[PDB]
Write an enzyme that holds these catalytic residues in place. Structure first.
Site, PDB file in Angstrom:
ATOM      1  N   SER B  47       0.843  -1.229  -0.156  1.00 58.14           N
ATOM      2  CA  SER B  47      -0.197   0.076  -0.002  1.00 58.14           C
ATOM      3  C   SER B  47       0.863   1.368   0.101  1.00 58.14           C
ATOM      4  O   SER B  47       0.240   2.243  -0.544  1.00 58.14           O
ATOM      5  CB  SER B  47      -0.945   0.128   1.130  1.00 58.14           C
ATOM      6  OG  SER B  47      -0.391   0.004   2.498  1.00 58.14           O
ATOM      7  N   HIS B  48       1.893   1.122   0.696  1.00 56.61           N
ATOM      8  CA  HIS B  48       3.073   2.551   0.744  1.00 56.61           C
ATOM      9  C   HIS B  48       4.200   2.222  -0.058  1.00 56.61           C
ATOM     10  O   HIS B  48       5.201   3.161   0.069  1.00 56.61           O
ATOM     11  CB  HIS B  48       3.201   2.568   2.123  1.00 56.61           C
ATOM     12  CG  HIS B  48       1.929   3.308   2.785  1.00 56.61           C
ATOM     13  ND1 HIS B  48       1.297   4.428   2.433  1.00 56.61           N
ATOM     14  CD2 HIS B  48       1.008   2.741   3.648  1.00 56.61           C
ATOM     15  CE1 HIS B  48       0.134   4.523   3.015  1.00 56.61           C
ATOM     16  NE2 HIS B  48       0.057   3.578   3.983  1.00 56.61           N
ATOM     17  N   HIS B 186      -6.474   2.516   5.209  1.00 59.03           N
ATOM     18  CA  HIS B 186      -7.111   3.136   4.137  1.00 59.03           C
ATOM     19  C   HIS B 186      -6.428   2.885   2.825  1.00 59.03           C
ATOM     20  O   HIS B 186      -6.880   2.421   1.654  1.00 59.03           O
ATOM     21  CB  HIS B 186      -7.049   4.762   4.269  1.00 59.03           C
ATOM     22  CG  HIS B 186      -7.726   5.358   3.105  1.00 59.03           C
ATOM     23  ND1 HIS B 186      -9.062   5.676   3.052  1.00 59.03           N
ATOM     24  CD2 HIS B 186      -6.844   6.051   2.045  1.00 59.03           C
ATOM     25  CE1 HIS B 186      -9.000   6.357   1.838  1.00 59.03           C
ATOM     26  NE2 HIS B 186      -8.160   6.539   1.270  1.00 59.03           N
ATOM     27  N   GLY B 187      -5.344   2.769   2.996  1.00 58.93           N
ATOM     28  CA  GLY B 187      -4.259   2.237   1.592  1.00 58.93           C
ATOM     29  C   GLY B 187      -4.679   0.997   1.244  1.00 58.93           C
ATOM     30  O   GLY B 187      -4.477   0.923   0.076  1.00 58.93           O
ATOM     31  N   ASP B 188      -4.964   0.107   2.042  1.00 57.75           N
ATOM     32  CA  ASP B 188      -4.899  -1.224   1.501  1.00 57.75           C
ATOM     33  C   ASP B 188      -6.579  -1.241   0.865  1.00 57.75           C
ATOM     34  O   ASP B 188      -6.909  -2.216  -0.091  1.00 57.75           O
ATOM     35  CB  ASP B 188      -5.174  -2.276   2.446  1.00 57.75           C
ATOM     36  CG  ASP B 188      -3.634  -2.376   3.144  1.00 57.75           C
ATOM     37  OD1 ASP B 188      -2.834  -2.890   2.305  1.00 57.75           O
ATOM     38  OD2 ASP B 188      -3.392  -2.443   4.347  1.00 57.75           O
ATOM     39  N   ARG B 303       5.117 -15.948  14.853  1.00 56.47           N
ATOM     40  CA  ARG B 303       5.619 -14.500  14.320  1.00 56.47           C
ATOM     41  C   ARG B 303       5.462 -13.359  15.454  1.00 56.47           C
ATOM     42  O   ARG B 303       4.560 -13.076  15.833  1.00 56.47           O
ATOM     43  CB  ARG B 303       4.674 -14.389  13.069  1.00 56.47           C
ATOM     44  CG  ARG B 303       3.360 -14.991  12.912  1.00 56.47           C
ATOM     45  CD  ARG B 303       2.270 -14.832  14.014  1.00 56.47           C
ATOM     46  NE  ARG B 303       2.419 -13.244  14.152  1.00 56.47           N
ATOM     47  CZ  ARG B 303       1.752 -12.495  15.138  1.00 56.47           C
ATOM     48  NH1 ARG B 303       0.828 -13.514  15.921  1.00 56.47           N
ATOM     49  NH2 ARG B 303       1.699 -11.287  15.226  1.00 56.47           N
ATOM     50  N   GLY B 306       6.851  -7.794  12.936  1.00 58.47           N
ATOM     51  CA  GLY B 306       7.622  -7.332  12.147  1.00 58.47           C
ATOM     52  C   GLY B 306       8.481  -8.348  11.586  1.00 58.47           C
ATOM     53  O   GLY B 306       8.947  -8.019  10.398  1.00 58.47           O
ATOM     54  N   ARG B 308       6.854 -10.811   9.412  1.00 53.82           N
ATOM     55  CA  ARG B 308       6.586 -10.760   8.223  1.00 53.82           C
ATOM     56  C   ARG B 308       7.424  -9.978   7.156  1.00 53.82           C
ATOM     57  O   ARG B 308       7.801 -10.232   6.297  1.00 53.82           O
ATOM     58  CB  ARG B 308       4.968 -10.231   8.087  1.00 53.82           C
ATOM     59  CG  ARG B 308       3.981 -10.886   9.044  1.00 53.82           C
ATOM     60  CD  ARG B 308       2.647 -10.499   8.962  1.00 53.82           C
ATOM     61  NE  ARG B 308       1.975 -10.729   7.691  1.00 53.82           N
ATOM     62  CZ  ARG B 308       0.799 -10.401   7.484  1.00 53.82           C
ATOM     63  NH1 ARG B 308      -0.179 -10.099   9.040  1.00 53.82           N
ATOM     64  NH2 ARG B 308       0.219 -10.783   6.566  1.00 53.82           N
ATOM     65  N   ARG B 309       7.333  -8.709   7.745  1.00 55.20           N
ATOM     66  CA  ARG B 309       8.394  -7.563   6.852  1.00 55.20           C
ATOM     67  C   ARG B 309       9.864  -8.161   6.663  1.00 55.20           C
ATOM     68  O   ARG B 309      10.433  -8.111   5.682  1.00 55.20           O
ATOM     69  CB  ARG B 309       8.188  -6.491   7.290  1.00 55.20           C
ATOM     70  CG  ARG B 309       7.094  -5.488   6.800  1.00 55.20           C
ATOM     71  CD  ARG B 309       7.006  -4.044   7.336  1.00 55.20           C
ATOM     72  NE  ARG B 309       7.152  -3.844   8.590  1.00 55.20           N
ATOM     73  CZ  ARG B 309       8.064  -3.626   9.329  1.00 55.20           C
ATOM     74  NH1 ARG B 309       9.279  -3.626   8.630  1.00 55.20           N
ATOM     75  NH2 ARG B 309       8.136  -3.073  10.531  1.00 55.20           N
TER      76      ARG B 309
END
EC number: 1.5.1.21
Lengths: 332, 337
Positions: B47-48, B186-188, B303, B306, B308-309
């Site tokens: 999204s970003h 919102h971005g998603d 998990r 963080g 995941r990233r």
């Protein structure tokens, strides 16, 4: 149901604490805190908590005579060893220094370690907001919340509180557990024979349940908002325990102290002068946010419920079941 | 299906830097935004990531945001720094005050950075990660444009309002989370609308306040719900108060880009709190956090926030960053290729 005034309730509770071994100083602090909770309609944090306070004091689990040790460690940092005593007396011992630092440096932290917190969290941030400062607080409690994706409980209910001033009214204050439901409310549902909505907790086998008795009987609670509340709960462990030096929610137990009911952890408070070097007035900005919230339909603002009850208590007194009043008198 | 290609992390940074420079940003701003955007893409924060390039450019072209703004750093207290972003982006403002903020945090124990008049069009975790990598704890909040209906309200008012947190750990990369206080970021919602797919239910409503799973229904007169219910709404209110109320920046509903066709960047503010967890301490925070990590794995949380990233990051550095052929060609064209 008899009616007692706020100051009357304070004197009554103070007597109880003194009778049960607390120092006069601790009694003053706890009596006011408990009475304030009752005054504001926070029953789960009011006189209802007296038995737990006393049972915890009885075994020495919590030291009602502890003398907080204040450590001035930085221009904007204060640490306090609660010395196995309650958190409120420790906060009170460092409050003036904390406020001086916040106003001078712009922001200041108070890191309390080795403390027992058995009350609502909003009472801790409210005073700062009444004085024009913004305050954020976190307190980790006792293991009962399953981290998102995990199979066993680890985090405590770990509440977070926030207080901020507003130009046209009482402070904007909220206080929320990061668990989906407060532990105290689970016991209530149990006693009243009420089921809980889905998603509040699991039974001893880790299976979802709506039965409050199942949660209490070896079960556990779930974090609010799934992974989001879980992350915030982890933050509370890290800030109220990891940073302060106090125990994480799973680093102590009541197995050797019959009647213990308090978590022995710590507390973090961040106090900010919102207007430090500002070309505006935070209190005016917050008042505008309140106006806009009303404009879009939000009738009640966080804290509104308590302020209305508070007004009632000061005008008509605090209503208490004669049964509870008599026993409080006997405990006194 | 769209054929894909791979670009290395450094190549993507160079490409985006050229794009920003060609489109009117100062070299300082281009360096900061290129690294930020590329880092988001590298970590899988779709999204970003590059998804934001068109919006960055149309906002710049409209004159809505000043790509050559020079942040004004204001040393206002032993532990307090304000920065006037001067209608420019938030990241360059943060970068300009970073050294002073860290000095104050280490000296005083904690320090605040209050950015006002800034445009933030990115993920929030990149703003706290660096502090944690240096052994400090960081908390940040930023508000956006109006899109969330407060609990009990009928119309939207709050922004997506994310909260980010970063903390060091003795035996691994920083523990970091970045969560929107809205049910879904919102971005998603925009990503879903672009990919023409539906969203899970219970996250937003349409213009009539009725439940919907159509991202377009939410974006066009609709709204998002606060996460978790009343508690998420309270936290969202806190974000407005901290990122805007305290900084001097606009609340999510206090700016209008109707006079600037193409404007998409929120013009608000940002708050950052940086702490030396060990100030005057008789223990080491990093050891305590590592113990918490050990206990979390012990109860079954595979998990950590963080992870995941970090997994996507490792994959990107090993196999390169996957990008649609069409998107890469578009970026190359924007850069002048």
């Amino acid at each position: 149901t008899q009616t007692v005034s706020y100051p009357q309730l304070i004197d009554l509770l103070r007597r109880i604490f003194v009778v049960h071994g607390t120092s006069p100083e601790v009694a003053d602090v706890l009596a006011e805190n408990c009475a304030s909770a009752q005054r504001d309609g926070s029953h789960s944090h009011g006189i209802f908590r007296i038995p737990g306070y006393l049972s915890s004091l009885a075994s020495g689990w919590v030291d009602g005579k502890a003398v907080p040790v204040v450590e001035d460690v930085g221009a904007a940092f204060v640490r306090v060893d609660a010395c196995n005593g309650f958190a409120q007396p420790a906060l009170a011992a460092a409050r003036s220094l904390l406020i001086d630092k916040a106003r001078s440096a712009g922001v200041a932290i108070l890191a309390i370690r080795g403390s027992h917190h058995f009350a609502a969290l909003w009472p801790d941030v409210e005073p700062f907001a009444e004085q024009g400062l913004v305050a954020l607080s976190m307190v980790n409690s006792m293991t009962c919340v399953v981290p998102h994706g995990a199979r066993q409980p680890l985090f405590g209910t770990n509440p977070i509180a926030f207080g901020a001033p507003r130009a046209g009214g009482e402070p904007i204050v909220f206080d929320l557990a990061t668990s989906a439901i407060a532990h105290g409310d689970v016991q209530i549902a149990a006693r009243e024979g009420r089921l809980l909505p889905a998603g509040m907790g699991v039974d001893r086998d880790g299976l979802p349940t709506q039965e409050p008795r199942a949660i209490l009987d070896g079960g556990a609670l779930l974090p609010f908002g799934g992974h989001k509340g879980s992350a915030l709960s982890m933050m509370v462990e890290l800030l109220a325990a990891g940073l302060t030096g106090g125990n994480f929610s799973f680093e102590f137990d009541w197995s050797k102290h019959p009647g213990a009911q308090t978590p022995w952890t710590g507390q973090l408070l961040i106090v900010i002068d919102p207007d430090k070097g500002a070309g505006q007035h935070f209190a005016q900005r917050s008042e505008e946010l309140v106006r806009q919230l009303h404009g879009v339909g939000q009738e009640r603002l966080p804290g509104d419920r308590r302020y209305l009850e508070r007004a009632r208590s000061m005008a008509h007194g605090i209503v208490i079941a004669q049964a509870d009043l008599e026993r409080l008198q006997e405990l006194a």
